[PDB]
Amino acid sequence: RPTFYRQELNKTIWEVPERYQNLSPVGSYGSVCAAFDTKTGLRVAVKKLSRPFQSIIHAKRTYRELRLLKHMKHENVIGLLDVFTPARSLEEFNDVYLVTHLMGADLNNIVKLTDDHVQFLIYQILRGLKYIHSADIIHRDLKPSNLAVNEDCELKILDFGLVATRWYRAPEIMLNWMHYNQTVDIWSVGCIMAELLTGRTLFPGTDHIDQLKLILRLVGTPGAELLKKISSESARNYIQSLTQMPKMNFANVFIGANPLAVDLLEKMLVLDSDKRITAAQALAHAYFAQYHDPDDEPVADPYDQSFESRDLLIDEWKSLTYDEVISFVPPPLD
Ligand SMILES: O=C(c1ccc(C(F)(F)F)cc1)N1C[C@@H]2C[C@H](C1)c1cccc(=O)n1C2
Numbered sequence: 001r002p003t004f005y006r007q008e009l010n011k012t013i014w015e016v017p018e019r020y021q022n023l024s025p026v027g028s029y030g031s032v033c034a035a036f037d038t039k040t041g042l043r044v045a046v047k048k049l050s051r052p053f054q055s056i057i058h059a060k061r062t063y064r065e066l067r068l069l070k071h072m073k074h075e076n077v078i079g080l081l082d083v084f085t086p087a088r089s090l091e092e093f094n095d096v097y098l099v100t101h102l103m104g105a106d107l108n109n110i111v112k113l114t115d116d117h118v119q120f121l122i123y124q125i126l127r128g129l130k131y132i133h134s135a136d137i138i139h140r141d142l143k144p145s146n147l148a149v150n151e152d153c154e155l156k157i158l159d160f161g162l163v164a165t166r167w168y169r170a171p172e173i174m175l176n177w178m179h180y181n182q183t184v185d186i187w188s189v190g191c192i193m194a195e196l197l198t199g200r201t202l203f204p205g206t207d208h209i210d211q212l213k214l215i216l217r218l219v220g221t222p223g224a225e226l227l228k229k230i231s232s233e234s235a236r237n238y239i240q241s242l243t244q245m246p247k248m249n250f251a252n253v254f255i256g257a258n259p260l261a262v263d264l265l266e267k268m269l270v271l272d273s274d275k276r277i278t279a280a281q282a283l284a285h286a287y288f289a290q291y292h293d294p295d296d297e298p299v300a301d302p303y304d305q306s307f308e309s310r311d312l313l314i315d316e317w318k319s320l321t322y323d324e325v326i327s328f329v330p331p332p333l334d
């Protein structure tokens with residue numbers, strides 16, 4: 001066991017190993033301090049989870065967050081440098097601290113951009129996504145605040161960003177489809193890319209109805225091929241009885257932009273998720289010509305998410321989270 005010290009920041013107390021120094025609060029899932037890690041010499045982000053075991057839903061959330069972070073080993077995805085608790089035993093285990101690399105800023109703070117910069121940033125998102133998706137994980141909440149970028153324009157997909165979330169959400173999610181796939185994240189990338197290129201939120205809906213309306217303006221109302229794949233009786237009604245809208249030509253919409261950028265946007269922002277380009281396919285698109293390397297775009301080890309369907313007691317989730325704290329193997333330093 002390392003030696004811990006206490007202090008107070010923003011009402012919240014913090015009990016961290018002495019290894020981590022100069023804790024400075026940066027924003028409030030939980031609250032984050034920037035710190036200096038004496039062991040590795042790195043600036044780091046230390047995230048104290050807020051009430052990790054307040055309920056079954058929190059406790060499962062906490063377990064889920066730890067499992068996901070421990071699995072992620074890729075340059076474009078947030079990784080775990082360390083995880084610790086001040087607790088001596090399971091009996092007193094109440095607090096979870098997660099340690100990751102401190103990134104300079106989020107893509108929300110980055111505001112338009114040069115086309116060569118958007119190429120590099122969207123390349124990196126897709127590279128991280130190929131990896132996440134290969135493990136059968138779907139991010140579901142991609143948006144500029146969940147994309148951390150450092151001084152060097154190096155980008156990492158984040159867990160959580162600690163602006164409406166609806167703005168980047170795939171329409172099949174909006175409409176509550178149950179069998180949506182990994183391309184929901186591709187939709188979001190499409191929305192993010194569009195915003196980087198024009199400097200404006202692509203679909204700034206005031207609510208879920210307005211959101212779908214704005215999406216449909218650009219992509220058009222469902223065609224015959226998509227219509228016949230819709231299972232829900234009312235969903236089909238709501239769309240067979242909205243004023244039919246043509247798909248817009250994206251060239252008419254993103255005027256100025258690189259035609260390759262426009263073309264990729266066309267492949268990402270397909271209303272029908274069956275037709276939408278995957279992360280692996282997008283990486284091969286000509287737009288990423290100067291970055292694409294099929295030998296340096298790894299996939300992930302398999303990830304066991306069987307726990308997702310399990311209905312457990314709060315103290316069981318807490319116990320399993322505790323095992324995960326204990327079994328953690330720090331990554332080897334450079
Ligand atoms: O499933 C995730 C999630 C969690 C962690 C990670 C990461 F970066 F660690 F791999 C990715 C996605 N998210 C979907 C939503 C909102 C966010 C992001 C989130 C963060 C942490 C736990 C969680 O249940 N959720 C539910």
Ligand SMILES: Nc1ccc2c(NC3CC3)nc(-c3ccccc3)nc2c1
Nearest residue numbers: 171172175176177229230231232235273
């Ligand atoms: N193979 C597919 C492909 C796309 C789909 C989609 N997406 C459309 C943008 C709404 N929506 C729905 C659906 C089903 C029931 C209720 C609400 C939505 N199903 C889809 C099945």
